[PDB]
Scaffold this active site. Structure first.
Site, PDB file in Angstrom:
ATOM      1  CD  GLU A  61       3.038 -15.863   4.983  1.00 54.03           C
ATOM      2  OE1 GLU A  61       3.593 -16.925   5.298  1.00 54.03           O
ATOM      3  OE2 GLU A  61       1.793 -15.775   4.875  1.00 54.03           O
ATOM      4  N   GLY A 112      -4.259  -6.227   9.691  1.00 49.81           N
ATOM      5  CA  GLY A 112      -3.301  -6.044   8.600  1.00 49.81           C
ATOM      6  C   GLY A 112      -2.997  -7.304   7.810  1.00 49.81           C
ATOM      7  CG  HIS A 122      -1.544 -14.279   4.500  1.00 49.63           C
ATOM      8  ND1 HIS A 122      -2.472 -13.337   4.113  1.00 49.63           N
ATOM      9  CD2 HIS A 122      -0.499 -13.584   5.024  1.00 49.63           C
ATOM     10  CE1 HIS A 122      -1.997 -12.126   4.354  1.00 49.63           C
ATOM     11  NE2 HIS A 122      -0.808 -12.246   4.917  1.00 49.63           N
ATOM     12  CB  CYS A 146      -5.208  -6.590   2.945  1.00 53.80           C
ATOM     13  SG  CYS A 146      -6.745  -6.639   3.863  1.00 53.80           S
TER      14      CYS A 146
HETATM   15  C1  LIG Z   1      -6.381  -5.679   5.310  1.00 55.57           C
HETATM   16  C2  LIG Z   1      -6.191  -4.207   5.045  1.00 55.57           C
HETATM   17  C3  LIG Z   1      -5.525  -3.521   6.211  1.00 55.57           C
HETATM   18  O1  LIG Z   1      -4.295  -3.453   6.292  1.00 55.57           O
HETATM   19  N1  LIG Z   1      -6.275  -3.046   7.202  1.00 55.57           N
HETATM   20  C4  LIG Z   1      -7.748  -3.044   7.209  1.00 55.57           C
HETATM   21  C5  LIG Z   1      -5.655  -2.501   8.392  1.00 55.57           C
HETATM   22  C6  LIG Z   1      -5.756  -0.997   8.405  1.00 55.57           C
HETATM   23  N2  LIG Z   1      -6.676  -0.199   8.991  1.00 55.57           N
HETATM   24  C7  LIG Z   1      -6.482   1.138   8.790  1.00 55.57           C
HETATM   25  C8  LIG Z   1      -5.294   1.413   7.986  1.00 55.57           C
HETATM   26  S1  LIG Z   1      -4.543  -0.084   7.551  1.00 55.57           S
HETATM   27  C9  LIG Z   1      -4.729   2.733   7.557  1.00 55.57           C
HETATM   28  C10 LIG Z   1      -5.801   3.775   7.869  1.00 55.57           C
HETATM   29  C11 LIG Z   1      -6.492   3.561   9.214  1.00 55.57           C
HETATM   30  C12 LIG Z   1      -7.329   2.278   9.305  1.00 55.57           C
END
Ligand SMILES: */C=C/C(=O)N(C)Cc1nc2c(s1)CCCC2
Length: 180
Positions: free
Chosen positions: A71, A145, A40, A147
């Site tokens: 993916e 999630g 993606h 990224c």
């Molecule tokens: C796109 C990045 C990602 O995976 N994000 C923003 C989700 C997450 N939020 C947190 C994570 S991973 C680990 C620490 C707590 C907040």
């Protein structure tokens, strides 16, 4: 401990912050100028890597023997630098794990280690409308999630994080042959 020791060494030498037109992503450099990203991310002819503009020489979206989306996108980068070769840490067959750590590394979430626990076989998954194969599942209660992320256990690199349902997360399993 030893699990985090491996994850930390992987971050330092092989996990990079990138940005495409689709946003911020964790990139795993595998060897040479070969890297992998969640599909993606849709890398273009150029990509931002650690704040530098890099040409993408080739981009291949991986599918299984039925043409089902995995993916994963393999990219070859226009650079002189070479990633440490980590393919020996990628298992020959997609592997589950206990006490797994998800390594996220983007500009907005730098050098982030998330304990996800057990990673279990899942298989076929309809990911946001796209049938996908060879997935594994773990606890990951976030709706953001999107990224990428590198799923690791003690001395093994087992998956690329591809998304979730707000309670569980899912990774595309990694096999060594993808990078042969
Ligand atoms: C796109 C990045 C990602 O995976 N994000 C923003 C989700 C997450 N939020 C947190 C994570 S991973 C680990 C620490 C707590 C907040």
């Amino acid at each position: 401990g030893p699990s985090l020791d491996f994850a930390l060494s992987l971050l330092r030498r092989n996990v990079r912050q990138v940005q495409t037109d689709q946003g911020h992503f964790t990139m795993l450099g595998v060897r040479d100028r070969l890297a992998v990203l969640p599909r993606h991310s849709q890398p273009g002819k150029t990509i931002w890597i650690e704040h530098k503009l890099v040409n993408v020489l080739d981009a291949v979206e991986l599918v299984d023997e039925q043409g089902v989306n995995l993916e994963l996108t393999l990219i070859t980068l226009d650079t002189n630098e070479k990633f440490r070769d980590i393919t020996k840490f990628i298992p020959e067959n997609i592997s589950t794990a206990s006490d797994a750590t998800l390594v996220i590394n983007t500009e907005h979430m730098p050098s982030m280690f998330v304990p996800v626990g057990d990673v279990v076989q899942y298989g076929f998954l309809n990911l946001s409308g796209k049938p996908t194969g060879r997935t594994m599942m773990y606890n990951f209660p976030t709706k953001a999630g999107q990224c990428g992320g590198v799923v690791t256990s003690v001395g093994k690199i087992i998956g690329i994080h591809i998304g979730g349902n707000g309670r569980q997360g899912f990774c595309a399993g990694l096999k060594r042959s993808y990078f042969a």
